[PDB]
Amino acid sequence: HGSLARVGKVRGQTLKVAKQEKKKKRTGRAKRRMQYNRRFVNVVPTFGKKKGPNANS
Amino acid sequence: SAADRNVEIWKIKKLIKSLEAARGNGTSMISLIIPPKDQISRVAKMLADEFGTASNIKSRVNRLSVLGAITSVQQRLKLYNKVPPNGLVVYCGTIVTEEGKEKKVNIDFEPFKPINTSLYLCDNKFHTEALTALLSDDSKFGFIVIDGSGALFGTLQGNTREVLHKFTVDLPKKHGRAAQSALRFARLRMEKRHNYVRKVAETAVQLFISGDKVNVAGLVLAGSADFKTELSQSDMFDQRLQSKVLKLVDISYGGENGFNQAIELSTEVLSNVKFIQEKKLIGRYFDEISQDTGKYCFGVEDTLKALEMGAVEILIVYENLDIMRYVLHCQGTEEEKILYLTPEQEKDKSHFTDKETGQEHELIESMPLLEWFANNYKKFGATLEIVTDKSQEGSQFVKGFGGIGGILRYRVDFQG
Amino acid sequence: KSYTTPKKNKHKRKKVKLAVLKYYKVDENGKISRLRRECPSFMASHFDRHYCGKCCLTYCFN
Amino acid sequence: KLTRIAIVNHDKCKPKKCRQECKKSCPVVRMGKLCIEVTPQSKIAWISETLCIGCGICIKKCPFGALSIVNLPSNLEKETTHRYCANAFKLHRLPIPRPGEVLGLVGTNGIGKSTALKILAGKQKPNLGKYDWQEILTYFRGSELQNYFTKILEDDLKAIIKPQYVDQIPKAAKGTVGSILDRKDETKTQAIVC
RNA sequence: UCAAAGUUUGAG
RNA sequence: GGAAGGGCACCACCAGGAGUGGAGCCUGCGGCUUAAUUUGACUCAACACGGGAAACCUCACCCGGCCCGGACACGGACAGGAUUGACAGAUUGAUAGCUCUUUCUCGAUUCCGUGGGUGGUGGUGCAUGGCCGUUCUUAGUUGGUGGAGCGAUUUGUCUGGUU
RNA sequence: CCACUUUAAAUCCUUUAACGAGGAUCCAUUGGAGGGCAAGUCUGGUGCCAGCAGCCGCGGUAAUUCCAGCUCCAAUAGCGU
RNA sequence: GUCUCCGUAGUGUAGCGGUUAUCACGUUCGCCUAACACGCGAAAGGUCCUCGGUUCGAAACCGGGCGGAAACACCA
């Protein structure tokens, strides 16, 4: 029992949006550089009860 | 009366439309159906324990709603003292509607047809799948269970299983123990055994015919003992009745218990029949296209233009159209018109500016077409034939021609 | 919110300010002649009555 | 396993004169689907035999009978050697020339026999029902066709045709017979052939 | 110095 | 726990009292009924409870009609005065200028957008605070430091007498 | 892309003239971001539906688990199944 | 066809010419229970199959009606 109906119910009705235009992201090695720089050399601050890389209050 | 019956069907269809829409936030709704034979006490008890259970429901808004509905469905049942014939259908709950208006409702009624489909539910919504499935299946089929012992004549809806009339007989013994008399007694036995068949074949006319036309779309004969056949293929059984002999079914058992067996062995055929008749009708529709003739039509524009005028004979429609009749209206001038819009053209359309004057021509709400036909096909030309997309001729009608058209009462030329 | 068709809404007023309103006439350039009657306490012209615009006083000659 | 072809005689269709008729009469088109596309402008009435039912109504209506719809075995949609247009004739497979052998073609006419012969002469590229050469050869592997066409493309095989209509040779070639054989000589075996 | 005492929303 | 020990409470019993359940009424629920009969609370721990004895008010409910008490901004709107407030007489329930006909008016109020407010006895106590009530009127409850356990934990908080 | 070289004859590399980059470009993907397990209690839609989820689970109207946007993480001419 | 018997609250049955028509179950309404069941107390409910007769009086006795069920249908 139960119909095979609603199927694509949600995916259908969601509010479609464009995916913006930001930038060519740096690739290969350069990407890796930039990553390395932002873990170790730029910040290295005084600590305040642990970190977060995608945290947002 | 026929007209009063058609009003009661329309009433119930409208009731279903509302109950399917209803809905209520939080809460549940007592779906309920009490079949004809049942004892209502039995239902009262069931409810009372369903009450007691519901009092341990953890959610409040659901709980208190369900308890309320069960309290009130019990009170409805108190007003009846025997189960009404043709069953009972109760529908309690606390439906929500526009204006943020939480409203309680308790719809009970004997439905016009007998029905054989009990049901109890609490759920967020009401359940009317039973009811629609008893308006759809009109198709009454006649059953006759012949046996050496005796007969049984009975009618049959989708689920409902009626017993019209019956009898049994003391037929003679198989053998005659004198050498000469053996032959005479045999000939005599053949005469009383046949006479029984003659009686059955008359009684079936007496029961399953009405005003020189059989009331049953089939006529299943059943039994054992090469008897049902003796009826089936006799000159005594009336040819208009025997035209609609639909099955000879070899059942074990006889009589009432014989009945059910005869139905379960019949199930496959009574499904095919509804498709067979459909194939036949559309087959003729196509014949008029195949030969030049002229007496067919298709596509709303043409078909309704044919209906409006010197009408169609038969109007054929796929049982769900999407297609819908809208009533358009002007703000200033008060000029109005109506149009038959497709699912794509009805949903969003910049066409409906008034243009000549120069205003936004507002589309006042619709009435979906198939229903529009069902309302007022009688005020035209008649025989509204609902069809399907199961048969090859059915699908070709639905896919190609648009599931709409009709066989016309005479030749008509169309233009543009 | 299904509003009834014959009931419908009820529109409110729209005034009509007809430019600079004239209550006066020029008699021999220097002197002036007033058209409409003034208050005792322009008590304007109705079709029969003489209605005030402020102190709500009312008069008519039968 | 049965599909439909629609065919439009480019001579008998004159979409300006008749003012449509097919558009109006076709149920698919009244259904609201691009089954036929015509307009008063634009030569030759188009049909999506894809969306066509094959009702056989448009065939009756058209005032010159320009529209011919037929069925055809679903098998044959694979093996389609040439189709010149939309709603045109549709050859299926080719003959299989083998060298050292006279290939006898047989069958009634108006059945792509000239299209076969053009293709095999190499003047016509068998479009393969597309409307290419490396894609063509690959379609003819395992079969003497690929050797045939490959042989054509590197050494230009000279295609020579004895035609059907013999009485449109007169209105072209002048002079005596004996002169004309001498002009076209290459084998240098006139006397033996004569 | 031993009578009877069965069951428990699917609705989180 | 329809397992054993102790030990206790008239929201437990015993002994008794006065009763309630019976009647008429008063009032609260639930039902039915209804335009509406607003709603919360249903074992103790809902039901003369909401300090709820509602004529109106209260009031939420329904059936009617007024009103803005729509701040501020950015603008459009700025004077050929944007467009707040008005005895008639018809209408209205109404001595609501609410509307139609007509008056004339603060004179910088306005109206329209958008942002955005604001209110609401609207929904959600199963989103929360606070406050109650109940567990639970009984004698119960906790960590420190030591000891016991791989540990969850335990001991202290205990055989006994006592209250 | 001229020309050598290559080579049986070529191609390819290689060498080599001449043109040949502002990132709108010569545009890096594949998987995930509740736990195992690196990484959002972000913002929209859905409302035990659709769906995700190897396992534990998420979804019944504030979803860190769905469908989307944003960000973030892993590996990277590769990465899933 | 014959002869026999039986037709009584919702169900199954008692009923000796003067009965409030008996018993059991079921139903309804209280309690008991958190709820239900069990249990306890209450209550309602017979067209005595139908019609006619006898009788001071018939649910029964007697007649015919409509229903329903057993036994017989053998010797060639």
Ligand SMILES: Nc1ncnc2c1ncn2[C@@H]1O[C@H](COP(=O)(O)OP(=O)(O)O)[C@@H](O)[C@H]1O
């Ligand atoms: N160049 C062309 N363009 C359009 N249609 C063509 C062309 N050549 C032939 N046809 C169509 O193909 C049909 C059959 O021609 P063809 O196949 O050449 O003859 P056969 O069948 O004898 O080989 C004709 O009716 C004609 O309309």
Ligand code: SF4
């Ligand atoms: S054949 Fe019948 S269906 Fe196919 S196109 Fe011509 S008309 Fe439309």
Ligand code: SF4
């Ligand atoms: S097909 Fe027949 S009808 Fe349709 S356009 Fe060409 S000619 Fe006119």
Ligand SMILES: [Mg+2]
């Ligand atoms: Mg993980």
